[PDB]
Symmetry: C3
Subunit: 302 residues, 3 copies
């Protein structure tokens, strides 16, 4: 019964839609100057096994705007499994707080925390998925362009946590994703396979122009995040996938550009695109706050 | 005049009882859904010279439920005596906050902080005593079993901060403690000596069965916490003191099992005891929050 | 238009005066027992590239007393320029919070943050200036002695961030500073030059008695803070500049003694001065809270 928020593929489509609509409603009240406290007396534990300041700040502010409290815990203050079983940690933290946000590396420790917690566990992000970023992205898209149904997003470069959640979102929100990767039409991806089985249109190609053509949103991420630790090697395999003005001109004229920050200008995207009129990267970043507020509210309800 | 909370042996019995009764009253209001703010505008500084996340979380949530504020400070942000005299630190922090919680190693730096502070200083725990854990334990006992007066607790293994405060509590709350330790009837303990002089019945033995027989509560802690840094050596001196089903069967049929977490199943206690029907370890953990709220309220009053 | 608080030399005199008067007004309401929340829903990010616990605590409590929220970020959580451009950090943090306090080493990264932020940036302190400490000092002076106009402060030892802001304050609040330094009447200081051009009377001398004579406030700081990393060398160049009873007796009979903590008794000041009846060091420390509240309120207004 507990309303965990683990991944887009573990929450029903109708509920994800309800969360998005609530995010818009709460954002409207906030921008109108309303300060409210529906979750006064609720506490969110925030466990960070790896550093993510933008995730910390966006969840912290969001919880406070709901009237709740937050407690920031590091890996050094808390590594699940170090000093006691994860079950014991989960059961004790459940006696003190009302929800637990976790940023972990591997998925398994988050799932074990959720198994034994009696309060909701929220995936702030992991190495393999990033549902909260993608909720922020879908929110941003709809704010700028209207209903996302049937639209096409084109991802440039190779997979990472954000792309994995994006293809899950294509299923849950009934849109399409074109993916231009050196891996070609043979990506071998559990996420793509799940998305296709659950309503997404996914096309995989080596060719950026083929993916971008007529697309409604062009998305990329850093060379490091996409699996190239080496700068020159990164430059090498990813330079053909760069989001530049020439690539954006192949997309729909009203296309948006998105990027889960941080970005490196001149690498995966040029200055003129990310700081140009099609970019929504800062609105996207703001929407981490507004989307995550609605996820928190959904988890805390009842 | 300042209401420091240093140790059970430094607060009068009647006041400790008042604190316990207030803990029950406030807990009842909380469970009934009331959110209140009697100490709005009060700030608790929390100084941790050594890591204790369960102590941090339980004090933080408790202070917030009183309507107050908390500030988390580490040893690296604050080691008493490093960059200025402790007197200077105490006097300045007293100008900013309304109470100071400290987790220190040795007692002396806590006492010097209290000497110079003009706000209450609270012993969150030290290497030598743990009054807040024992207030939580007495609360838990009475919630499950009624008045603690005249009851008998049996501790298995050797001394540590928790046992030291437990024997002080035996005096202050008029109960008995049987202690089964390799040290035998010759423990040589300042705490036992003080407790006996102040109303406690204390019996020390090498024999776990003698200590446990007919007892109302069986308590233990980790081999490391009880002075054995080596695992095999720990196993070696402490395995006869393990709390297992055979030992629990020697106690009163209504006996409780307690353990200041974290615990190591298969070492000082077996799975079947700590996860069985006599165990109250998670309620005990929850009661850190409720007991410490009442200590904070007592310190902050007037 | 954005109300950054960078330095005393970047804010108009009339506004600095307004801030001081508001600090007194808000302090009076607080001491009278009023708990108010004019900036409910406002969030202050606190970026510390170098440790300063007294700065953290004083800003945190102050923001909370205004009804706002704070988020503590370290250098390791945030070093401006490490993982993305400072512009990108500024623009994203501006979407989440309402003001940004920064403690940096060098001024330049604070100024770039302020260039790109769309919320006020506040200089908590830097290696080169300390406007908030000096606002606290001027507040303290006026509370104990009345209007500061035309008074004379005497600084003993060599320059540092505090002295730099003090000489700026001499201009902005129309008072005088005598500076006794081994550098003599040839200090070569951009701050002195600016202050003189903007209304301050500044006299520089090697002779402590000449600086102290008839002064209304005697101020010093640690040997390390004044540029002597070596203790024996420090003792060596600075011992003639020590603030002791003999030096205080040369000042006006009603002179105050000030020191931005921490202090080292027996080095730059003796016990009998800092713990004696002319010392206001603890009131000065308290006034970090009250002065910084008024700076926050000024930045957050409108
Ligand atoms: Cl992120
Ligand atoms: Cl503990
Ligand atoms: Cl400072």
């Amino acid at each position: 019964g507990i309303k965990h928020f683990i991944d887009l593929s573990t929450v029903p489509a109708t509920e994800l839609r309800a969360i998005l609509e609530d995010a818009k409603a709460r954002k409207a009240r906030l921008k109108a100057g309303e300060v409210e406290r529906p979750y006064a007396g609720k506490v969110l534990a925030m466990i960070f096994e790896k550093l993510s300041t933008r995730t910390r700040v966006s969840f912290d502010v969001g919880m406070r705007q709901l009237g709740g409290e937050t407690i920031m815990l590091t890996g050094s203050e808390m590594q699940l499994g170090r000093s006691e079983t994860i079950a014991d940690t989960a059961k004790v933290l459940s006696r003190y707080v009302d929800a637990i946000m976790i940023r972990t590396t591997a998925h398994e420790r988050m799932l074990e925390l959720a198994e034994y917690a009696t309060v909701p566990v929220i995936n702030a992000l992991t190495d393999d998925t990033h549902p909260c970023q993608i909720m922020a992205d879908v929110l941003t898209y709809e704010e700028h362009r209207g209903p996302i149904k049937g639209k096409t997003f084109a991802w440039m470069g190779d997979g990472n946590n954000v792309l994995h959640s994006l293809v899950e979102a294509a299923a849950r929100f009934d849109f399409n994703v074109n993916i231009a990767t050196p891996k070609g039409s043979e990506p071998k991806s559990q996420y793509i396979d799940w998305a296709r089985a659950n309503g997404a249109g996914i096309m995989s190609t080596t060719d950026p122009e083929k993916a971008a053509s007529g697309a409604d949103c062009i998305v990329t991420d850093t060379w490091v995040s996409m699996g190239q630790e080496d700068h020159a090697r990164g430059h090498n395999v990813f330079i053909p996938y760069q989001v530049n003005a020439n690539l954006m001109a192949k997309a729909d004229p009203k296309a948006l550009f998105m990027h889960c920050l941080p970005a490196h200008r001149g690498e995966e995207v040029t200055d003129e695109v990310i700081d140009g009129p099609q970019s929504v990267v800062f609105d996207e970043a703001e929407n981490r706050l507004h989307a995550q507020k609605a996820i928190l509210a959904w988890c805390l309800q009842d």
